[PDB]
Design a protein around this ligand. Structure first.
Ligand SMILES: Nc1nc2c(ncn2[C@@H]2O[C@H](COP(=O)(O)OP(=O)(O)O)[C@@H](O)[C@H]2O)c(=O)[nH]1
Ligand SMILES: Nc1nc2c(ncn2[C@@H]2O[C@H](COP(=O)(O)OP(=O)(O)O)[C@@H](O)[C@H]2O)c(=O)[nH]1
Ligand SMILES: O=P(O)(O)OC[C@H]1O[C@@H](n2cnc3c(OP(=O)(O)O)ncnc32)[C@H](O)[C@@H]1O
Ligand SMILES: O=P(O)(O)OC[C@H]1O[C@@H](n2cnc3c(OP(=O)(O)O)ncnc32)[C@H](O)[C@@H]1O
Ligand SMILES: [Mg+2]
Ligand SMILES: [Mg+2]
Lengths: 431, 431
């Protein structure tokens, strides 16, 4: 299919960055359609690590035009920081990166707010990445936030910014009893970059409609994961954007009927950073194992990540929410050396009922317990293996079992962090 | 196609209610996926008017199950009010209506807030319908708002509600210097209806995935219109939800790949209630005419509606944003008796540039001017006509011209408010 969507089917960090980088070889465009720099994508090419947050993961391929879709909450400071870093490394970002004038801006007060709220919640704290994602989205929805296109008139921008800031400042000092955020500091930091920012603007919907009508290969890059969806995730322990395939058309402006294949990234084992339900969470040795081997620590905040077994029930919600076309089994190489692996196939609800469907809001997950299927592990190494043949049968069964349990084929299997450490069984672009 | 989406291509009020009611004859389900009771849908069957706001327009057909999707901001008071009204009229709502536990709740403070903000904006006031749509969506995104499923535990609900209310109350009295909203009044009004509310809950995504897998005819009913889209509309003069086809999958939980046909409702002339850009707005006799004949006054607030000529440029943005499959030319009967009609085919930008693309945010529409195409009108009456033959050639040309100018066929033509006063040239369900 021409328009391919790559997204996380769990709670982020499944490995979208690598896969997006990999798959963009044949792509004309790559589009981020939601989130901001809370995202953390690690690309590894012949050993060279590149960590992207706000910039689309297709930025390393000169044949691809990376787009920041209107859905993205964009931090000028964050963009500048990343651009500079890639530029020093030979990546002419400004030559490859375009962006929507409709993108809301993440300015300092947003982080001020993000921190304050987080504080206020005390114990039942969400565990947000500390960027100002939440407030930026709130300001969008409230229709008071600033967007890229607001920089088209700096004086008017100073007017709007003065307003929005006094408004937020009042809340910060009087209610939160927190320090105000200096309006002039913000206006200044902003105006300095404004010109660079404005230079990358393009009418994204139209560009995408044109690309679409030409047949251009376009990849949409997801941020965060399905279960962190503001609507469909473990609310309120979620991110503030729709991480489900529906955000592509809303955050890019491309009509929904033009999505061709939805590729869902699947970690082979589960992780979460932030508070919230997690039935298959492990707190034992194997958990520790899964964490160490997988080097599970957030690419955007370091914070160790919670680990647990893959959960076909949660994965199955992801399948329906996103119209999955196929999966990209990632980190299989991490299971190597376990005596046995297991998949959560059903949930035992607190009233005794057994169910193969997930609850929605966090409180409804309160006391659910996982009912497992236990498969034999494999001692052979699968790291770097690039052909099914190189995988032991135990691994092949685990893979088939996931397919059986989900009804979606594993078209791509990843066995290490490096771009080429992958098995492309079915390339979504031909699919 | 099995899953058909019906939405407004302009600024609301194109006539979704009638069309949805009409088209649901063959439907198993009808789903609202966004907005709340700011919407106003007028159904007319053999002269009997029915005005829906929050309840899906398929509620009058016992063969159809009406669903309030998670995307909808739901006012318990509003729901109760409408249910009662339909029940007295022989409509057993509770028997036909189901709803998502994920729907955020619109409670009193939300209206308190909606009013306060509106006040604060003074002159540059959005012109929101006065329901608490904006705040309810903000509370959603901020992850502090209450949802239907929160009623599954009334004590915890009282806890969460006490919190959210003190929070908002502080803002209302100290900043806005407005009157606080009584927590106990809210908790009470809510708890009284809670049980009814909870009784209608269903897991909508799953139900839709099942329906989808059965082949069931499902209609998604849009609220508001494309150009009022929070992301793609004339921001900030927009509604707080994505009125574009992308909201269907986000606000219903049905995977995006399962949308089959997107039907866009097209008024044949333009209207707007609320502040904001409107290039083809008319302030002359014909405007007055268009308003009087069309009886253009908001079904949700009465407020006279601004009128202007149809705008192919704005309509064309709608075509790409929503992947339109076809149009439903509505109110054609209203043009009868004009000497000449005209369509805006291009925009003359303020720097002299001529463009066939629309700007996004309001300020960017600032001084655009419409460049028209002037077609001969028609004196014959088209009211109630149900066969193309009954339409004068002048009308047929106007219709073909819209098709030529947009590239989307007019599969349905409506010539009066009554259900049967329509021409179904291509029924989306077979399409
Ligand atoms: N061992 C192993 N590491 C992988 C594999 N695929 C990706 N990685 C690494 O695992 C991490 C994926 O987390 P992250 O980059 O935050 O993924 P993203 O947030 O979804 O883009 C990064 O450290 C990658 O370098 C794989 O198949 N095996
Ligand atoms: N004259 C005329 N009225 C129509 C036609 N279709 C619908 N109506 C009426 O025009 C209005 C449509 O506005 P509204 O009900 O608010 O549409 P909605 O908000 O899109 O559901 C209602 O008064 C309908 O009764 C039509 O083809 N001709
Ligand atoms: O308001 P926010 O800043 O968005 O934080 C809210 C919640 O969402 C989580 N979170 C945010 N981005 C995440 C991410 O990005 P990628 O998978 O794309 O690499 N991966 C994993 N978890 C992520 C935070 O942990 C928290 O639970
Ligand atoms: O915050 P809000 O309460 O949503 O108001 C914001 C803006 O959106 C407009 N508006 C809201 N619902 C509308 C509607 O519903 P239907 O077309 O579905 O019948 N039709 C037309 N205009 C509508 C208001 O006029 C205002 O411009
Ligand atoms: Mg990451
Ligand atoms: Mg209406």
């Amino acid at each position: 299919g021409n328009n391919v969507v790559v997204l996380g089917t769990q709670w982020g960090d499944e490995g979208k960055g690598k896969i997006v980088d990999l798959l963009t070889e044949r792509a004309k465009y790559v589009v981020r359609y939601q989130g901001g720099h809370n995202a953390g994508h690690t690309l590894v090419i012949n050993g060279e690590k590149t960590v992207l947050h706000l910039i689309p993961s297709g930025i390393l391929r000169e044949n691809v035009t990376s787009i920041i879709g209107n859905g993205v909450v964009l931090s000028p400071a964050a963009l500048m920081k990343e651009m500079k870093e890639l530029e020093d490394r030979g990546i002419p970002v400004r030559e490859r990166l375009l962006l929507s004038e409709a993108c809301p801006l993440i300015l300092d007060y947003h982080v001020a707010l993000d921190n304050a709220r987080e504080k206020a919640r005390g114990a039942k704290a969400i565990g947000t990445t500390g960027r100002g994602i939440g407030p930026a989205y709130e300001d969008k929805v409230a229709r008071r936030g600033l967007r890229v296109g607001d920089l088209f008139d700096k004086e008017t921008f100073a007017e709007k910014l003065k307003e929005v800031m006094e408004y937020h400042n009042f809340q910060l000092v009087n209610y939160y009893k927190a320090e105000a955020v200096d309006y002039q500091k913000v206006l200044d930091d902003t105006m300095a970059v404004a010109d660079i920012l404005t230079s990358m603007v393009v009418d994204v919907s139209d560009l995408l409609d044109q690309a679409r009508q030409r047949g251009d290969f376009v990849m949409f890059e997801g941020a965060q994961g399905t279960l962190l969806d503001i609507d469909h995730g473990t609310y309120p322990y979620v991110t503030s954007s729709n991480t489900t395939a529906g955000g592509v058309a809303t955050g890019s402006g491309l009509g929904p009927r033009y999505v061709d294949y939805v590729l869902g990234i699947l970690k082979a084992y589960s992780t979460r950073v932030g508070a919230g339900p997690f039935p298959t969470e492990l707190f034992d040795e194997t958990g520790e194992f899964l964490c160490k081997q997988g080097n599970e620590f957030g690419a955007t905040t370091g914070l160790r990540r919670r680990t647990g077994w893959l959960d076909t029930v949660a994965v199955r919600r992801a399948v329906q929410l996103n119209s999955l076309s196929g999966f990209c089994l990632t980190k299989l190489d991490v299971l190597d050396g376990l005596k046995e692996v297991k998949l959560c196939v059903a949930y035992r609800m607190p009233d005794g009922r057994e169910v193969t469907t997930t609850p929605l809001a966090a409180d409804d997950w309160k006391g659910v317990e996982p009912i497992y299927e236990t498969m034999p592990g494999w001692s052979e190494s699968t790291f770097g293996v690039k052909d099914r043949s190189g995988l032991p049968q135990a691994a092949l069964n685990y893979i088939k079992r996931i397919e059986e349990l989900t009804g979606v084929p594993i078209d791509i299997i990843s066995t290490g962090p490096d771009r080429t450490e992958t098995m492309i069984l079915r390339d979504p672009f031909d699919a």
